[PDB]
Amino acid sequence: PALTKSQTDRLEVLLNPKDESGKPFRELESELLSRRKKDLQQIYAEERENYLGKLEREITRFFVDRGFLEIKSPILIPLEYIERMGIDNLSKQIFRVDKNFCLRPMLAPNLYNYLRKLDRALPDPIKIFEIGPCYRKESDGEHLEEFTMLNFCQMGSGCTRENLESIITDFLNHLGIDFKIVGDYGDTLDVMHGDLELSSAVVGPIPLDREWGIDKPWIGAGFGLERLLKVKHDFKNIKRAARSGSYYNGISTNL
Amino acid sequence: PALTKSQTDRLEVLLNPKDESGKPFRELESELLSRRKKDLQQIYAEERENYLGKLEREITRFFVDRGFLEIKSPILIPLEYIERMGIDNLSKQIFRVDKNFCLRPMLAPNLYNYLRKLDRALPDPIKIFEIGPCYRKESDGEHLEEFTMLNFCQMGSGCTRENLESIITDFLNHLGIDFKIVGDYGDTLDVMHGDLELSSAVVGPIPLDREWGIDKPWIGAGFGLERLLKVKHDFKNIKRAARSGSYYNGISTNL
Ligand SMILES: CCCOC(=O)NCCCC[C@H](N)C(=O)OP(=O)(O)OC[C@H]1O[C@@H](n2cnc3c(N)ncnc32)[C@H](O)[C@@H]1O
């Protein structure tokens, strides 16, 4: 009669945010399975684009159109970059590779490097952004160990908290994601969606800048793409938005 | 009078495939520096798109339009997948992470998984592709340790060597890359550009398939994006096309 907790989990896996007691487990499952196969069939026949890849392309067009240079830097970076970011023995939340490298847990390091180098060639202000894989050993989850970050930044003139909030606002209203900016330069703003942190943004300059050869004011923000997708598609668990073999655009692939 | 080998290397770094003795090093360098800054300035003012990111988007549109489903799977995969690919103690060319994972050296594993799972929901034939970071400890270089692979595959009907060659041909003529297919099912074709291997393609089925729960015929090919860019932009060294802090669209960032 009553579904076991295990059966309920199984059905939840097959449940979509938009689906709407009695009937036995096998029938409820057979029903959801047919719906999910049809969903996949519709995607394969029409769209064919992956949510994460498509979001990245949409975000890229948004920043490129607003004057930001598109950066693609290494994912495997020197461990020294992590120390240089002020993270000495969070240090174990780092995925290490070999003796001197690791999987970037964030984008700041390579972006700092580009800001410094580009300043010798580009007119002020320097505007850049990167979208790509970042890695952090996790606990909760909202928390993926493998995720995708969008980090944009501007250095030089126009680097005010007001301009930063304006970019964030246009960006999220563009994506159709509800949010609230919270704070109270050297400032740190938290872009929230309910209790979920969408982004921790900062208005420089900050003491860390010196360690990277940066001496100008700057503004920047980092957003996790899977979180945006989770909020956007009303996914209950963020793993439905992650690179995975278990879900395709939020649809279970275990059919 | 004569440039030292070190000065020549420096100038080569600043040299673009399209630039065309006497003058002293400092003057030759100052000349190249101004040109490179202008190049970067033109990119920042107009395009703003990264070569690698832009190629990925172009390849994606190409396969999506031809009926292939866009896949974004994990970059950090179980070490077991490598053994399962038939690579037992090349095994040390693998970047290991923690005790049970590694950085994917290729895309086949996750694509095999998707072919198996999608077959339970999608009509024949199943066509999918992925574009993303792959990692392999290297020696030569043509050889990056961090690169980007495009792997597409079709399973079920239509999986002939002829159809495979046709896709490869349309793809490369589309990108404007000269090539030659060489070979002699269970077939392996090498797509060459002069002496450079652009892709090692295969016509299944192959014995390995069974280990992945795949029992249908299939065709597939893997192309390294940095190599395509290298050939396309006539870069002398492939590192000019890689994710890097040292080059931006083939232009030195050490100005
Ligand atoms: C000049 C250049 C230097 O720029 C900076 O130094 N800082 C720019 C300000 C941007 C913040 C920085 N990129 C950052 O990493 O903030 P934080 O680490 O708290 O993470 C920001 C966002 O990444 C996402 N995120 C994090 N970990 C996860 C996870 N495990 N799963 C899913 N989503 C996640 C989430 O959106 C989180 O709010």
Ligand SMILES: CCCOC(=O)NCCCC[C@H](N)C(=O)OP(=O)(O)OC[C@H]1O[C@@H](n2cnc3c(N)ncnc32)[C@H](O)[C@@H]1O
């Ligand atoms: C059903 C699914 C299973 O599909 C398959 O099992 N096989 C599909 C056939 C595709 C070949 C496979 N993806 C592969 O990896 O072939 P191979 O490892 O020789 O590499 C293919 C290409 O990757 C590129 N590549 C490699 N290593 C580098 C490097 N270090 N720097 C730069 N470029 C590089 C280069 O283009 C090379 O030819």
